[PDB]
């Protein structure tokens, strides 16, 4: 009556929720804190409604409209506070750069290898865009009508079994972990930190678990586009709070829109 499976992949449990499979790119903005949130929120809305509502929730809205509570926009921010904002002010829809999907698609260009310049470039120094409470032209519902709200937000304890339970019952979560330089060149298998300097904390989306070659892992989506790592995802050692991956997990339940 509480028997967790040895592996679980949210993409398989909820196969009619395409956002679960979807990898975003934060570009050259320190907005992973926002991406981890809106990604897991998108997933949970679809899960909550048995795929009747499947929406890409706007990173742009959160990045630009949260203000003090959430930190400093493109210069970094706070996951727990992102989910609190969703409960209070809600978030509109918005897809990928130049997608024309949703109310407020992300306005910052992706940074995967690109050639012959049919796109604005990635730069170290970028402003946080302004909080514009208007939907993109062509998108029909007004800004206010397009808002999706949280019922609650909460921390998940630093406990492997509690995080697995949480994902199994309620859907993907946001977490954070310490990035070391060996992480940048991750391509496959289970990531374990073995060399390289500390590079700071990073927010991500945890969407499942398993065991590979006898090594327990968490299945995690990154926000550095699909060209990074294992098609944008990675696996990281599970059960030892590795790099703090189990220590700062947050989530929340959506309010029913359907």
């Amino acid at each position: 009556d509480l028997k967790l499976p040895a592996s679980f992949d949210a993409r398989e449990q909820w196969p009619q929720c395409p956002t679960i499979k979807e990898i975003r790119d934060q570009g050259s903005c320190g907005s992973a804190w926002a991406f981890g949130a809106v990604e897991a929120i998108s997933d949970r809305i679809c899960i909550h409604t048995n795929a009747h509502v499947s929406v890409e929730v706007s990173a742009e809205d959160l990045l630009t409209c949260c203000g003090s509570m959430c930190g400093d926009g493109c210069n970094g921010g706070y996951p727990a506070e992102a989910w609190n904002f969703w409960t209070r002010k809600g978030l509109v829809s918005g897809g990928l750069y130049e997608s024309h999907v949703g109310c407020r698609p992300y306005s910052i260009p992706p940074c995967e290898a690109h050639v012959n310049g049919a796109r604005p470039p990635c730069t170290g120094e970028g402003d946080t865009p302004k909080c514009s409470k208007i939907c993109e032209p062509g998108y029909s519902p007004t800004y206010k009508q397009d808002k999706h709200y949280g019922y609650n937000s909460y921390s998940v304890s630093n406990s492997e079994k509690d995080i697995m339970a949480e994902i199994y019952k309620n859907g993907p979560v946001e977490g954070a972990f310490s990035v070391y330089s060996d992480f940048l060149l991750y391509k496959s298998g289970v990531y374990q930190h073995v060399t390289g300097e500390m590079m700071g904390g990073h927010a991500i989306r945890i969407l499942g678990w398993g065991v590979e070659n006898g090594t327990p892992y968490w299945l995690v989506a990154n926000s550095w586009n699909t060209d990074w790592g294992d098609n944008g995802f990675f696996k990281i050692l599970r059960g030892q709070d590795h790099c703090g991956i189990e220590s700062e997990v947050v989530a929340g339940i959506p309010r029913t829109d359907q």
């Binding site: 320190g30 706070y78 290898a113 700071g200």
Partner: protein, 109 residues
């Protein structure tokens, strides 16, 4: 040790053989980017020309995605003018012609 920053992009520094030159550049590796020598290494292209040590200084806080600064400590090993060419890039992607670059020339007698 000079404290060469972006404001000094393109400078020629006169230095002694053996002297340490300190470069500091803004960097935010939580976006996937960091500074590399051609071909995605932090190592000197040519050890007999100059050696390099590097260290990244993250903000020491829960402000996730705040940018920090990368320090490169370059020691000139031989006489001549030596280009230190760095590029800001995601290392799996490669650079492109739009990539942000930093260069300083180190001149030793």
């Amino acid at each position: 040790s000079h404290k060469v920053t972006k404001a000094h992009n393109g400078a020629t520094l006169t230095v002694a053989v053996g002297e340490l030159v300190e470069i500091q550049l803004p960097s935010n590796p939580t976006t996937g980017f960091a500074w590399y020598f051609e071909g995605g290494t932090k190592e000197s292209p040519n050890e007999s020309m100059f050696t390099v040590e590097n260290k990244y200084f993250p903000p020491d806080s829960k402000l996730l995605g705040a940018g920090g600064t990368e320090h490169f400590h370059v020691t000139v090993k031989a006489a001549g003018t030596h280009a230190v060419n760095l590029t800001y890039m995601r290392p799996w992607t490669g650079p492109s012609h739009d990539s942000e670059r930093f260069t300083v020339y180190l001149k030793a007698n």
